[PDB]
């Protein structure tokens, strides 16, 4: 599919933002369009101060480390990062390497992303609408 | 900024500051035709008086990309946006409606471009003024 | 009347590998045409057509913004082609 | 940004030493080298190809820099592209030429390039095989034993052609 690939991440003011590749006004000489998925790539080993991403183990627990290790929580259906709830790893629809995650407490709702005009931010919502994935390798 | 970007963003101030000689008017008219900015093109066609030799010298502009490759009639017939501008050159009598293109799509006429765009208004205006196909 | 081949002395240079997309910049043109012009200006005097094309292919070896590998296809040439610029 | 030329010495040198390993090159004094560019910038049902103007300018300049008389055709349907290529294959100047170039730029699929009225329901596509057929020694004898260079800026599929590998 036509997925959005994030080359960098920015944890500022207790908030992590995902930087995407520069399209550079490059257009396709084919006819089509799609933007349903996104993924973070272990470039420079950003996936396990560089704002590294941590996935722990089925079920998973998500953490961010930018000189301050902080776990993620979805309580009250609101995303929060606390320096120290549970999500399940699931196969991405129509993908083999990608991996997505669903809330343990607030089921049916999965991790997602929105657009800060210049960056991309993490949220939680149910199946405007963009889905967060991770490459399994 | 530049003249082409000033025409694209409708920066009339820097346009008028840069638009001086009629060579500059030629270049600006070609840029307005290329970017389909009919308002700027008409404002220049009124702010300046264009002749037929003006159209020839426009055809001789190797600097202007749109005029280095496309004929002025091609630029006028490219899409419907330049329609009003076209009318000027047809009403003020500056271009032959049945002139065959010589640079790009050589042999075709403006009626051929109008047929390509599938625009009823331009086809009508051309046929009413007795436009013919090029028979390439 | 002598015997010849139906198809001979052909060469095609596609901007990408089969099944894949080729990319174009809305401000400068297509990446493939850009690099092609670059390599022709820089090397056509001392290299032949296939060598210039290999320079082009090498300039895409490491994927920068987008990934795209122009490919040679239907190559039926028996000799080398030197454009001999400036002559 | 300027085409570096080649000293006439090397011209004579290689044209004699590799007279069998290289293609014959006519003399500029009498050399009607022809080249054809076909470019579809705007379409009916498909997104426009912004930036193709620079490609046309650059390719035309480069080809005319190699003594090729360039003819450009813009916004043609697949059948019209076939007619343009067939006419280019019957032009007599080829008899006085040593090579030819065909630069074809549009949207594309695996089978071929896309005409201006293409659509997934109603395909208007010029197949590469038709291109190679029009200029073979059966339909364009004037180009027999001469290098026929075909350059195509067009997609050949829907995949991105990228992989994330360690």
From Swiss-Prot, chain A:
Single GO biological process annotation from the record: interleukin-18-mediated signaling pathway
Proregion positions: 1-29
Effect of residue 58 to A: Impairs binding to IL18R1 and the ability to induce IFNG production
Annotated keywords: Cytokine, Cytoplasm, Inflammatory response, Secreted
Compartments, as annotated in UniProt: Cytoplasm, Cytosol; Secreted
Factors inducing expression: In macrophages, release is increased by endocannabinoid anandamide/AEA.
Protein name as annotated: Interleukin-18
Posttranslational modification: The pro-IL-18 precursor is processed by CASP1, CASP4 or CASP5 to yield its mature, active form. The pro-IL-18 precursor features autoinhibitory interactions between the propeptide and the post-cleavage-site region, preventing recognition by the IL18R1 receptor. Processing by CASP1, CASP4 or CASP5 induces conformational changes to generate critical receptor-binding sites. The mature form is then secreted and released in the extracellular milieu by passing through the gasdermin-D (GSDMD) pore. In contrast, cleavage by CASP3 inactivates IL18.
Phenotype for residue 77 to A: Reduces binding of the preformed binary complex of IL18 and IL18R1 to IL18RAP resulting in impaired IFNG production
GO CC annotation, single: extracellular region
Effect in UniProt of substituting residue 5 to A: Strongly decreased processing by CASP4 or CASP5
Curated annotation (Swiss-Prot), chain B:
Disulphide-bridged cysteine pairs: none
Residue stretches of each ANK repeat: 24-53, 68-99, 106-135
Phenotypic consequence of gene deletion: Host cells display increased pyroptosis.
Compartments, record wording: Secreted; Host cytoplasm
Impact reported for residue 4 to A: Strongly reduced interaction with host CASP4/CASP11 and subsequent ADP-riboxanation of CASP4/CASP11
Function: ADP-riboxanase effector that inhibits host cell pyroptosis. Acts by mediating arginine ADP-riboxanation of host CASP4/CASP11, blocking CASP4/CASP11 autoprocessing. This prevents CASP4 activation and ability to recognize and cleave GSDMD, thereby inhibiting LPS-induced pyroptosis. ADP-riboxanation takes place in two steps: OspC3 first catalyzes ADP-ribosylation of target Arg, and then initiates a deamination to remove one N-omega group.
Protein family (similarity comment): Belongs to the OspC family.
Subunit structure: Interacts with host calmodulin (CALM1, CALM2 and/or CALM3); specifically interacts with the apo form of calmodulin, preventing calcium-binding.
Protein known as: Arginine ADP-riboxanase OspC3
Species, as recorded: Shigella flexneri
Included range, full protein: 346 to 481 of 484
UniProtKB/Swiss-Prot annotation, chain C:
Modified residues ((Microbial infection) ADP-riboxanated arginine): 24
Highest taxon of the lineage: Eukaryota
Effect of residue 1 to N: Abolished interaction with Gasdermin-D (GSDMD) and ability to mediate its cleavage. Strongly decreased ability to cleave IL18
Self-association state and partner proteins as the record states: Heterotetramer that consists of two anti-parallel arranged heterodimers, each one formed by a 20 kDa (Caspase-4 subunit p20) and a 10 kDa (Caspase-4 subunit p10) subunit.
Protein name: Caspase-4 subunit p10
Organism annotation: Homo sapiens
Native organism taxonomy: Eukaryota, Metazoa, Chordata, Craniata, Vertebrata
Span covered, complete protein: 291 to 377 of 377
